[model samples]
Target: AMGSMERASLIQKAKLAEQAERYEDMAAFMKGAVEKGEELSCEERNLLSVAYKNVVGGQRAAWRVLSSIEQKSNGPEVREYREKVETELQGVCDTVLGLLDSHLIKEAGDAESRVFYLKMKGDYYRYLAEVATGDDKKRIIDSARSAYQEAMDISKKEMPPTNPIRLGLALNFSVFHYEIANSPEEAISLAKTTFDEAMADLHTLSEDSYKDSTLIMQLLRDNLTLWT
Candidate 1:
């Protein structure tokens, strides 16, 4: 009913808090919303899921929310929101990585859903290599290297490479090689791999997927090709 709208708005506030890095605010808001949303209809339930994923999770949440809203709303706003969420989700991953530079880490536990957290860590370390100092740089690079390797290992087990995740990892790795490792040759090699894999994923999609991939690729390329 109309009450669902109010609930959705509250969920959005929580998401904003999440985006603001106000974890406590997000947790408090979600706790009540998720509890109250329990008795909602299927559509309402789906909306709540979107909120949960976007606020508490990251890219995984964005994708799931986009899919759910597409199936249910059919509004132009849904598509717009999907795109916005996609952009925000990517930023979230980047920001999460930034946090690691300060010796902080975020974990979501041992569930299969931890991929989002891992993806963020991989990106964070890549950026870390760029600006970290002696021991800090070494630690961040080593951790990022391990995270990216683990992610790639997991991807190999999947039938279809989850392009978005892989592309992000590859692009960040390319940046790491270029900026952190101070090696243009290594950066180019990794960039080719990232570009190839990303293009392959794009080929499998319709025109709708272009915007996200295009924006990310440009950003990735700019970072990797610096001083070349």
Candidate 2:
């Protein structure tokens, strides 16, 4: 009873924090659901992903900028700051992946959200590989690929052709193949198939996910343009 009550109040605060752009606050609130083993509705699950995505996403942009700047100068201080950034990014990914492994994935119950969660898992592992090198980087790359592949398998089997999460996974997985895997041909091929397949049934996409699905669908095409 208290768990249910806590989930309600927590989601309320999470929404408020989102409206205020206090994403860490929103993340903490949603994570409280996970902490209590409370089952999350789709909206709550989306909130959790959005909150952490923004948080970690900001850091990733910073890391890239810092890396570019660090390359120009060999200052020890700049190096130290980049190191700290990498450490912090890896820490958060580990924590989020831990939550997914422990609770989110195990209890997803639905293919739609499982695909969403696995894509997210792959994305973070991909980000982690950004700063890793050598064997360690390979491991992260493998993990990212595996997650994306599994998500795709599930999405194809159960998700709609126009589902936002399906398109989103296609976009990111194509990116993984292109960027990290250094296989532009493969990436473009994958994107081409996805773009064509998505268009094959374009009329079937409904309004609820119209905005999200169309956005990624276009993205898949745009990347194909550059790649091919």
Candidate 3:
């Protein structure tokens, strides 16, 4: 059981953790207090949600908590918080879609650009899937996978087999399979093929191209490490 002083101290520590951008710590502190049967005030609940938003992999929980507060309150602060959460929930999807729209105008005849845009569009849907629940999660993941597949098809038909962009698409698609689609075996197999292919292409590039590709290649490797 949590005493009043203990709860107050925990809340204060949580606030300090947020100020330091240690949002995961803040969330843990608040969650501990809650689990100990301390009832949080509206302001505390809002603070908890803010912590969730700042912590990686906590977006779904943030949205859920914030939306619950939105339902219970009509104050200006609550309304503003609700709007902020709503904007964040849609932000990545909207930005990627806008970029794709611009690419449509600028690269109307370029299949490479089209494929790149499709891959990014898939990324948007994957982000949505991360924050969604139930049937919505499934639908969003399916849409993401479809977009990635279409991009791959275009890249296969129009681009060189060793195109870096195609390899990047493959890498990300493989991650989606492992993480969201729950197909680890398929993910590992495809990732190994794409990773090796991309590395070969990297060695063939000029210094400038090699520099540009290095970061993404490292990221793909990192993801593979995590998956394994």
Candidate 4:
């Protein structure tokens, strides 16, 4: 069992390593110290999460750490720390979206990659919508819809109209129309069209074809049920 001084020294070393962009080493040291029952401040835990995220792409783990800290804090300083963590996480999402945008530009001729990147952009905008207020939320939702529509359009042109990817994108876009855009008629119409086309396409193919088509059809049915 390491004493407080030893744990502090390890934490200091981890911070230095992080500053030097030795994320793996920073994470290892912090994780070892924690396993040895060393107590970490909220900031230290945040840093540990950041190190893990950078080294292993553990974004969910980092989000959980920050969310846990935010949930547990009550004091003024803790509140401030939580806000800082929230801001940092949002910044990280924005930076990744920017990188994805650049990648999409470079891979413009790759339809599959374009759809993948657009889907990622839609997800980021949806996340941003959760944190934004009023007009900002509306704007983010619109951006998300645009991304989904662009992806769907590309999938439609490059693949079959009733492709599983297109079906999935249409399902999601329908939900956005219903909930965010408040256009239940458009939503229901889109969902119905997609469901009908997918059902028709499924019958024309072998049993193994359109394996995930049923899933999207079910979602479309659920959306229609909710809207009606």
**Candidate topping TM-score:** 2
TM-scores for every predicted model: 0.50, 0.92, 0.57, 0.58
Q: For model 4, name the residue pairs that clash.
A: none
Error of 2 at 57 (Å): 1.0
Candidate 1, superposed: residue stretches over 4 Å from native: 1-11, 17-112, 126-131, 159-162, 223-227
In candidate 3, what are the lDDT values of residues 1-228, reduced to their tens digit? 233447777788889998898986786676555544534454665565465446534555676788788777744887687667656767735544554454331453466656666776786687677656699678889989998998989887887545667777888898889878889988888777766767766767778777766666676688779878
**Cα error, candidate 4, residue 89 (Å):** 5.5
In model 1, where is the ten-residue run with the lowest total lDDT? 102-111
Give one digit per residue, the lDDT tens place, for model 1 in 1-228: 223546667677766875787654654454445445333333333343344345535545555668587878743877777667666554544544443322222333322323434555675555434434588678878887788667666555542332454566567666666766676798787776666666676767656567657667776667656635
Question: What is the alpha-carbon lDDT of model 1 when measured against the actual structure?
Answer: 0.56
lDDT of 2 by residue, 1-228 (tens): 225547778889889999999987887787777778866678877888998998898889989999999998853899999999989988888978988897888888789878988998999898888888899789999999999999999999997777778888989999999989887888988888888888776777677567677788899988988887
Ranking by lDDT: 2, 3, 4, 1
**Weakest 10 consecutive residues of candidate 4 by summed lDDT:** 99-108
- Number of backbone collisions per candidate: 1, 0, 0, 0
RMSD of each: 14.8, 2.5, 15.9, 12.8
* Candidate 3 residue pairs in backbone clash: none
Candidate ranking under TM-score, highest first, comes to: 2, 4, 3, 1
